[PDB]
Amino acid sequence: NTIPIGIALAQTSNVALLGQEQVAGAKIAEKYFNDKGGVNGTPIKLIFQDTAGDEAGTINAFQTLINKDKVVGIVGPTLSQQAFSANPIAERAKVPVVGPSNTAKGIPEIGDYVARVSAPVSVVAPNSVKAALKQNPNIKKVAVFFAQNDAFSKSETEIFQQTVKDQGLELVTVQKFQTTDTDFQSQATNAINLKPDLVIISGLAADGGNLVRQLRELGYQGAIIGGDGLNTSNVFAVCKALCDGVLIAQAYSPEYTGEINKAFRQAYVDQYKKEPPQFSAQAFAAVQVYVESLKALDTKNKVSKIQLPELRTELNKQLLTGKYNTPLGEISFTPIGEVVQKDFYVAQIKMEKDGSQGKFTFLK
Numbered sequence: 001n002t003i004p005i006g007i008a009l010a011q012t013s014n015v016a017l018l019g020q021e022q023v024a025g026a027k028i029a030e031k032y033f034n035d036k037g038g039v040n041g042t043p044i045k046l047i048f049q050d051t052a053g054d055e056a057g058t059i060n061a062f063q064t065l066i067n068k069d070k071v072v073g074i075v076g077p078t079l080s081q082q083a084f085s086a087n088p089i090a091e092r093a094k095v096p097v098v099g100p101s102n103t104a105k106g107i108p109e110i111g112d113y114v115a116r117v118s119a120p121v122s123v124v125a126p127n128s129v130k131a132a133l134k135q136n137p138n139i140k141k142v143a144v145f146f147a148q149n150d151a152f153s154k155s156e157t158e159i160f161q162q163t164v165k166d167q168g169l170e171l172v173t174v175q176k177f178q179t180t181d182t183d184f185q186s187q188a189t190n191a192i193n194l195k196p197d198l199v200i201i202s203g204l205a206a207d208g209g210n211l212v213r214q215l216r217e218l219g220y221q222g223a224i225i226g227g228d229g230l231n232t233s234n235v236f237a238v239c240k241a242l243c244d245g246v247l248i249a250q251a252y253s254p255e256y257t258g259e260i261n262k263a264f265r266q267a268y269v270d271q272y273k274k275e276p277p278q279f280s281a282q283a284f285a286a287v288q289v290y291v292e293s294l295k296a297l298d299t300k301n302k303v304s305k306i307q308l309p310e311l312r313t314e315l316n317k318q319l320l321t322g323k324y325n326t327p328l329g330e331i332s333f334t335p336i337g338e339v340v341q342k343d344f345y346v347a348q349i350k351m352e353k354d355g356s357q358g359k360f361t362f363l364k
């Protein structure tokens with residue numbers, strides 16, 4: 001007998017360039033927690049249902065997890081774009097959802113069953129602008145690009161634009177693209193003609209990486225910030241050596257000295273031969289929230305005897321009250337499921353000259 005927890009992430013489509021890191025973190029969590037006896041001796045079982053890259057696929061994944069797989073709760077989905085459409089399904093069904101990395105404004109407000117462990121754009125994004133200004137205090141002109149079809153990208157770009165204004169910089173253009181675009185020559189040229197000192201990009205991974213590459217090909221020599229959608233080594237293959245120097249804010253640090261981060265990090269490094277990425281840590285934290293909440297609930301009200309609809313409701317109620325020492329740091333939730341998290345960082349892509357390899361260097 002095991003306790004089923006649903007994992008609804010992008011395992012296929014270009015969204016999987018982000019989702020696969022999340023899957024990796026979730027699998028590390030499953031082993032970590034089951035090796036510690038699961039929920040008071042009862043193992044958990046992660047049940048994966050691929051969302052693919054759109055809303056319909058996410059709705060289908062959630063419905064399958066809820067109705068066929070009988071899960072006690074869901075971790076997912078990968079994108080805020082998907083969450084706004086699908087999370088209301090879980091809300092109506094009274095099934096908890098813990099979002100690992102969805103950072104658009106308004107996610108926890110979807111309802112009483114929606115929480116997230118990922119700090120939102122309003123507190124994550126401004127740090128990369130400040131870091132750019134530290135590296136070049138003479139930045140004056142900023143060009144901003146965003147994916148107009150993606151909910152998170154639109155939420156993120158609003159924060160970047162406000163931060164640019166608040167820092168006293170000139171916003172010379174805001175250019176739009178689609179996440180499915182591969183070619184950005186017109187928008188890139190239009191921006192380059194305005195002589196920006198800083199370019200900020202809010203998109204996802206393939207699109208963001210292609211845009212970075214093209215900006216450099218077209219002669220742009222200034223600073224570049226990527227938003228959360230570019231926060232994966234999967235961009236390295238796309239922009240190659242021309243990824244070098246991109247600044248990306250982080251809600252996780254491999255060097256954070258929490259005991260569980262040490263264990264998580266060591267497990268990750270031993271397997272994948274590199275530092276754990278943010279998205280992996282966030283997915284681990286989401287699973288941790290469920291395991292530790294299930295343990296707390298089970299101690300007060302043995303879960304093997306609770307019928308599923310009540311188990312879901314009691315688990316949701318419990319998880320919202322918990323305090324968790326996670327790879328992300330000590331976190332907890334507000335009454336509406338927003339994360340409470342203290343520390344943020346900025347990293348910078350450092351490519352080897354040949355462009356075939358790179359890493360994220362954390363700024364001090």
Ligand SMILES: CC(C)C[C@H](N)C(=O)O
Pocket residue numbers: 018019078079080081101102103104152228229230279
């Ligand atoms: C995987 C991440 C890039 C997702 C993004 N933070 C969002 O809210 O959609």
Ligand SMILES: [Cl-]
Pocket residue numbers: 180181182183184
């Ligand atoms: Cl295109």
Ligand SMILES: [Mg+2]
Pocket residue numbers: 107108109110111112113114115336337338
């Ligand atoms: Mg909520």
